[PDB]
Amino acid sequence: AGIAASITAKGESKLEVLNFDFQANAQLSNPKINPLALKESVKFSSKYLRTEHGSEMLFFGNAIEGKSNTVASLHTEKNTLELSNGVIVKINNQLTLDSNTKYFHKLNIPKLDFSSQADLRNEIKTLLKAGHIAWTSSGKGSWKWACPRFSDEGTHESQISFTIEGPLTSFGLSNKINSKHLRVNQNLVYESGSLNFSKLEIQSQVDSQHVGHSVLTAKGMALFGEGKAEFTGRHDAHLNGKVIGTLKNSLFFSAQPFEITASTNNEGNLKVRFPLRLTGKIDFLNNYALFLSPSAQQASWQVSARFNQYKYNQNFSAGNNENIMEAHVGINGEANL
Numbered sequence: 001a002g003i004a005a006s007i008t009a010k011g012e013s014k015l016e017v018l019n020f021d022f023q024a025n026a027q028l029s030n031p032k033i034n035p036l037a038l039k040e041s042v043k044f045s046s047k048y049l050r051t052e053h054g055s056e057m058l059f060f061g062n063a064i065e066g067k068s069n070t071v072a073s074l075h076t077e078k079n080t081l082e083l084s085n086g087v088i089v090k091i092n093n094q095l096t097l098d099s100n101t102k103y104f105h106k107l108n109i110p111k112l113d114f115s116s117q118a119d120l121r122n123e124i125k126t127l128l129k130a131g132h133i134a135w136t137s138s139g140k141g142s143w144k145w146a147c148p149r150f151s152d153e154g155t156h157e158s159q160i161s162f163t164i165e166g167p168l169t170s171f172g173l174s175n176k177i178n179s180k181h182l183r184v185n186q187n188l189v190y191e192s193g194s195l196n197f198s199k200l201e202i203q204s205q206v207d208s209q210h211v212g213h214s215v216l217t218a219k220g221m222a223l224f225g226e227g228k229a230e231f232t233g234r235h236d237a238h239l240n241g242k243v244i245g246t247l248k249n250s251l252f253f254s255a256q257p258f259e260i261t262a263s264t265n266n267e268g269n270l271k272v273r274f275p276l277r278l279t280g281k282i283d284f285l286n287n288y289a290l291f292l293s294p295s296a297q298q299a300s301w302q303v304s305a306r307f308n309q310y311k312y313n314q315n316f317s318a319g320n321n322e323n324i325m326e327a328h329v330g331i332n333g334e335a336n337l
Contacts, residue, residue: 002028009044016047035060049074055087064091071102080106095128103141116145133164143179154179167194183207198222200231212238218251229255245270245282253290260292281308296321309336 007024022044029037036059043052051072058065068087074080084102101122108115120141127134139158145151157176164170173188189201200220207213220231233251250265265287272280285304291297298319305312315330 001030004028018048019046021045033061048076062092066090078107078109080104080108094130094132096126098125099123112147114145114147116147118143131166133162135162136160152179152181168192181208181210192222195224197224210241212240214238227255227257239270242273243270244273258294260290262288262290264288279308282306310334 003026005024005026007022009020009022009024011018011020011022013019024043025039025041027037027039029035036057038059039054039056041054044050049072051070053068053070055066055068058067066087066089069085071082071084073082082102082104084100086098086100088098090096101120103118103120103122105116105118107117118141120139122137122139124137125135137158137160139156139160142153142155144153155178157174157178159174161172161174162170169190169192171188171190173186175184175186175188177184177186184207185203185205187201187203189199189203191197191199198220200222202216202218204214204216206216215236218231218233218235220229220233222229222231231251231253233249233253235247235249237247239245239247246267246269248265248267250263253262253264266284267286268282268284270282272282274280283304283306285302287300287302289298289300291299296319298321300318301314301316303312303314305314312333313330315328315332317326317328317330319326
């Protein structure tokens, strides 16, 4: 039992952008055993836009297959755009798909001397199995254009990693972005073996000429069942241009049974270049030290925030001990008038 369906539409007329020649088809087959080979082809002519598609679905009970494609290409007197897509899906025992996105764009506007090029690769590859996950992608692409009000060029590089196998999980990102004015490197590292451990790793590298360099990267080691958690937290930054200085950040601590200790330190000596020839001199000293224990506990807070000619030192020590408890409040400051 099969059906031969065929459609053919002709819009012959004046103007090339308006005339069209559409055609369609459809085929079927199903004798006894359901060996379906359903197919489709979408086709038409039109000077304004040419787009084509063909989808052919295959079925053999457990052998299930699917191939679909849709490609379009825009063309005119100023612009030239294209796109392609391939659906590759097959179902035999497990589930998997690989689909691609081919993106092109070329714009040329001679009115203001503009020429833009965009060209993007968007591909997905998945794998679903009985207890298995295999997921990855790559957002590869680049950009470029010449325009007096906006001129930039660079390459975008993305990669996604994800995989599941049993109680353990895996997940990693490698982001590489590069341009003529901004350069950032990004990495993600994640790992945790169910309720046993948890790996926390961040990688952020920002590079720019006008402001300077920023360095942010930190680690965290977490363990389950006992109460252990230690994160290595830090940051180093540079500022250039209208502002100059440093950003030091200390975030160190250990989470332990019957022992809690935290160390936080924040440093900055920024010098703001205000307009009308004014300079703001900012130096602040923010620190912290923790110790928690069943026997004795303590804390510390010291601030040395200073603005230009206005200095302030604030003293705060907190600590409980059985032999002696200290209680001092340091309130000191000076405001020039």
